């Protein structure tokens, strides 16, 4: 719709302004129970021909149930936590004796209901499949006949749709040992996920958001294995509660700003270190250095606030005016002259320096742009592909308005070579103090002579 970004050339970086946030901040758990009969041996005399497939179907089903019985650039400032927190707690509550019997009892005929456990937790229940009725009315009155023989084989396929799901369960929990990301549709179908959303204690606009984006919330959701006893095999979804929705939030790409000095290797340069996502949760901002935890879909981002920063709302002031006495403005400086380019939502920032051929080409008129020196910026609806160094890349092709503001070589605001290149985290205040103290040291050394 109205995607925009403004490439600052004072410090070479793009701010992909205009998106809606839909960030999660909580966890919502729910129990899903799949009931099942503790089937004995078939008690069949002879093998027959029509009744063969049911035998290995039930045998593989037994193998499944027995094996699952036997189952039981700013990342350094970022924190770490236990994502599996509430669901494992709910399963641990279900480990207590006499608790899961209440879920068994209350959820007898109604497909979904509410129970309360011994800690007052009263979220929701669901029973996903109905193996009691089908097993005890459609399988064993046929299977347990004298010298057993099915009426027909064409009645088995519906049981297949009642069994294969279980099988999926099998080979996705014997390899993952309890936790599966993303959540498969075999634990939770699409329409039933829509039902769980309409059963969530959330607002209706979040319900519409979930209904439009079932695949993303399916991607980010968790699953944790609960107990297996008294044939009520169950698992907890820790589908994310979404705290804040629809605030504008931007992807800051940063790019090298390094001088094209004739003497190679003597070109100090300071480049911004602020990669990632920023958006205003309450009166502060949530920062995400992990672009991988954040996912994009049709101007809708979805990301996890556990590995976020609750930084003050003064981050736009340093974004526009980098030299401001209100923010630390973390900048990384080094003598590296690396021809590097990035792709924003609506353009490409090339920063190639030294002997590096830099061309931006279309498939219509051949090559169309050439970058000699300095960081340069091209809108996405000006080019299609870019060749830099020895590599080609393709710019995004979404419709939007992008603008390039004229900046300045901030690297020339400092001394030609005083900057150290022996650190991995610094700010403009720390570097300015280093410059001031080195200037004081050299003037003292000149004065003592």
């Amino acid at each position, epitope marked *: 719709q109205n995607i925009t970004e403004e490439f600052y050339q004072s410090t070479c970086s793009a701010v992909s302004k205009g998106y809606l946030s839909a960030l999660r901040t909580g966890w919502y758990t729910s129990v899903i129970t799949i009931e099942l*009969s*503790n*089937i*004995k041996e078939n*008690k069949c005399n002879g093998t027959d021909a029509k009744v063969k497939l049911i035998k290995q179907e039930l045998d593989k089903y037994k193998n499944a149930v027995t094996e699952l019985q036997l189952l039981m650039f700013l990342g350094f400032l970022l924190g770490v936590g236990s994502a599996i927190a509430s669901g494992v707690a709910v399963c641990k509550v279900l480990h207590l004796e*006499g608790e899961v*019997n209440k879920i*068994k*009892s209350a959820l*007898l005929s109604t497909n979904k209901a509410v129970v309360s456990l011994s800690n007052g937790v009263s979220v929701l229940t669901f029973k996903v499949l109905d193996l*009691k009725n089908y*097993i*005890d*009315k459609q399988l*064993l*009155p046929i299977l*347990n*006949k*004298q010298s057993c023989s099915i009426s027909n084989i064409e009645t088995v396929i519906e049981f297949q749709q009642k069994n294969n799901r279980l099988l999926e369960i099998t080979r996705e929990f014997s390899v993952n040992a309890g936790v599966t990301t993303p959540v498969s549709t075999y634990m939770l179908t699409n329409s039933e996920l829509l039902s769980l959303i309409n059963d969530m204690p959330i607002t209706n606009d979040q319900k519409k958001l979930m209904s439009n984006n079932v695949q993303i919330v399916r991607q980010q959701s968790y699953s944790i294995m609960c107990i297996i006893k*008294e*044939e009520v095999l169950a698992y907890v979804v820790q589908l994310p509660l979404y705290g804040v929705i629809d605030t504008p939030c931007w992807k800051l790409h940063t790019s090298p700003l390094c001088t094209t000095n004739t003497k190679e290797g003597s070109n100090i340069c300071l480049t911004r270190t602020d990669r990632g996502w920023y958006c205003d949760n309450a009166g502060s901002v949530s920062f995400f250095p992990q672009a991988e935890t954040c996912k994009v879909q049709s101007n809708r981002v979805f990301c996890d606030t556990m590995n976020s920063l609750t930084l003050p709302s003064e981050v736009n002031l340093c974004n526009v005016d980098i030299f401001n006495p209100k923010y630390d403005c973390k900048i990384m400086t080094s003598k590296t002259d690396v021809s590097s380019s990035v792709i924003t939502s609506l353009g490409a920032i090339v920063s190639c320096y030294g002997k590096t051929k830099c061309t931006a080409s279309n498939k219509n008129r051949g090559i169309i742009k050439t970058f000699s020196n300095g960081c340069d910026y091209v809108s996405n609806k000006g080019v299609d592909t870019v060749s830099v160094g020895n590599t080609l890349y393709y710019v995004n092709k979404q419709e939007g308005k992008s603008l390039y503001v004229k900046g300045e070589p901030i690297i020339n605001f400092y001394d030609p070579l005083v900057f150290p290149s022996d650190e991995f985290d610094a700010s403009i205040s720390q570097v300015n103090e280093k410059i001031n103290q080195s200037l004081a040291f050299i003037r003292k050394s000149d004065e003592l002579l």
Partner: antibody
Amino acid sequence: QVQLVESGGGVVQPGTSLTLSCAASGFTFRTYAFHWVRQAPGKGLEWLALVTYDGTTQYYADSVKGRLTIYRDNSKNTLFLHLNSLRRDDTAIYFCARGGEGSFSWLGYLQYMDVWGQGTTVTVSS
Amino acid sequence: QSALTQPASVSGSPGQSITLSCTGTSSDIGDYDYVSWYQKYPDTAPKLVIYDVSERPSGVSTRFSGSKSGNTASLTISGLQPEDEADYYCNSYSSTNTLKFGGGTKLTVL
């Protein structure tokens, strides 16, 4: 030791929906299953109902279904039937009985009569 | 109330054999190998006698023997004692997910 004992019973008015309570001691409770049968003076046995471990798959006879319900307790180990719309024909003795050894829910596995109690006479009169 | 056909009363002198039976349909005691036979005394409890067609449980004499053929189940006894004056029942899993009893069979001696 294995035993069952009985409570309730006696003279009941027509209608007058009744809860009948069994009792048991001296063996495992939660594992096996219990069930109810009747027989009238002059008539033979006829099946009433069965429950499994916990409250699950409450099975009933075709000529009884809807009229009588059954629910068990694992805290005080007592069988609770409750019958409704009491006709004239229900004057009979009601027997607790027990069946099933493993944790099974299929009715074919639950057809075994390992033990019996003493039942209770229930009569309807006016 | 549908039931299972049985003789009302069978008479046998002591030390003989009786081959009492009950007959149903295929969706009944016929097949499904849930033939059940029970003894009962007047005003006392019933008691397990025959289950799984031919196999005997605890606390019953060896002279009991159960069988079935077609849609008729049968119980055979050998060398009677005066203590078998009782009434007998047959029980089965019907096809409509329910249990079905018999009409009762009285058995005595002179």
